Amino acid sequence: PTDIDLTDPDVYNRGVPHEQFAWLRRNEPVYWHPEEGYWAVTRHADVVAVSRDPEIFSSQQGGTMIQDADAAPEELEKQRMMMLNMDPPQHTRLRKLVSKGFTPRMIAKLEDKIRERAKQIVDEAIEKGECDFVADIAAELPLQVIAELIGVPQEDRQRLFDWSNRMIGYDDPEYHSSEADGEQAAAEMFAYAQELAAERRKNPRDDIVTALVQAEVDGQKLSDLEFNMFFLLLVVAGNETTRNAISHGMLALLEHPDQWERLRADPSLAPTAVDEILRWASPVMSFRRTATRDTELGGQQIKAGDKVVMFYASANRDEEVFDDPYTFDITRSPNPHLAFGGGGGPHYCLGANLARLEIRVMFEELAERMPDIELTGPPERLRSNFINGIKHMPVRFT
Ligand code: HEM
Ligand SMILES: CC[C@H](CC[C@@H](C)[C@H]1CC[C@H]2[C@@H]3CC=C4C[C@@H](O)CC[C@]4(C)[C@H]3CC[C@]12C)C(C)C
């Protein structure tokens, strides 16, 4: 087709450009886009290869955002204490410090409380009748859960939601008002997080803030900025990913009504349904790396300093991996999708167990309760070159 600029948010205004991805996978799977420029990596195996080699494909050298913020090097330095933008050994140490609360056994203990919240959220949405599926359901469950898990009082959860909207929504006019919105949001959140850390140091609780201030690995503890940036990461990741998998998942189930019928008849399909909802929605569309040295990928020569972009949404339609990839099949198995990153990468989603649980519980509850969910208008996409997000989705229940 054309040589679309896949770092341009407007390219995604009418949905994920899956035909361009499909053409690239078949014809130019490792493709240099000129513009200085970037390599588009669109095949499943190549995204896996890039992800599992941080020595060659660095997250630190040029950060992980896909658009050229090169001549503003102050924004790279403002984000370099983000765990996402660290290479080993720095990243290894930080990941060990923060990982304890997200092991499967730690996440498994949350299922009953998550289920209680999802049941109440769905109940209140059903009584409301007409509502926004995002604000009242898809956003509300992960927001309540992430507040309770972190240790933020439920009364303050709306501040968490507004902050993270301002931090990721820098390309959407509704979510942000000026170029310093996210920086100011970060300053406010850092002040809030430090208050919480101070309280839990004096008086520990069973929450993630207490786990973080108490954590100690190899004689190391979290510094103030390390704590602040992980607190931020948890809040934003918790509020800007799961809700989009839920929104796009509900949309796909309504757009493929036979699949929704079968989930409501057999709720034991929910685990595989979650993975197909993640493959389908690919809420995190892409992440960037930078080649630390000359190297070859898919028979293509990548130089030191070259920007390399992994497109997870393209990999999640790779015909070599998924049979009939444009079919939404909630029983698809196996389903080695890359929605959480390439398998084998050191940055593979720390919250993957929590995300799956939240999505599974929510759609179970939406299924067990069997209201007739129906769209009353077109969903409004988030303007972004990074998130595949739904801002609003008006629906009617029963
Ligand atoms: C719900 C859908 C989610 C998706 C699709 C998603 C996607 C991703 C992706 C693609 C990465 C980077 C992988 C890589 O670079 O190799 C990542 C990293 C990460 N995610 Fe998730 N995520 C989700 C939910 C969550 C949640 C709920 C949390 C925590 C509350 C979370 C916490 C993190 C953290 C801390 C990292 C950085 C790990 C590191 O750098 O070592 N994520 N996520
Ligand atoms: C939903 C995806 C999820 C998390 C990715 C987040 C944590 C990345 C995305 C956008 C970044 C911000 C951009 C601009 C600035 C301004 C700066 O002054 C302070 C740092 C800050 C807020 C950056 C803070 C970090 C942000 C939110 C998954 C994939 C981990």
Structure description:
The chain is of the alpha+beta class and 398 residues long. Helices cover 47% and strands 10% of the residues. The chain has a single domain, classed as Cytochrome P450 (Cytochrome p450, Orthogonal Bundle), CATH 1.10.630.10. A hairpin with a 2-residue loop joins strand 6 and strand 7 (300-302). It is classed as lipid binding protein. Keywords: P450, Heme, Sitosterol, CYP125, Ancestor, lipid binding protein. The assembly is monomeric.
Looking at the structure, the CATH topology is: Cytochrome p450
Structural class: alpha+beta
CATH architectural designation: Orthogonal Bundle
Q: Describe the largest sheet.
A: 5 strands, mixed
Question: How large is the share of residues in beta strands?
Answer: 5-15%
Bound molecule types: protoporphyrin IX containing FE, Beta-Sitosterol
Oligomer type: monomer
Principal-axes geometry comes out as: globular
Distance between the termini: 44 Å
Helix and strand element order: HEEHEHHHHEHHHHHHHHHEEEEHHEEEE
Count of spatially separate domains: 1
| Spatial order of the strands forming the largest sheet | 1-2-8-5-3
PDB class: lipid binding protein
Keywords: P450, Cytochrome, Heme, Sitosterol, Phytosterols, CYP125, Ancestor, lipid binding protein
Assembly: monomeric
Entry title: The crystal structure of sitosterol-bound CYP125MRCA
Essential attributes:
lipid binding protein, Cytochrome, about 45% helix, 3-stranded antiparallel β-sheet, 12 strands, P450, binds Beta-Sitosterol, monomer, 5-stranded mixed β-sheet, alpha+beta, 17 helices
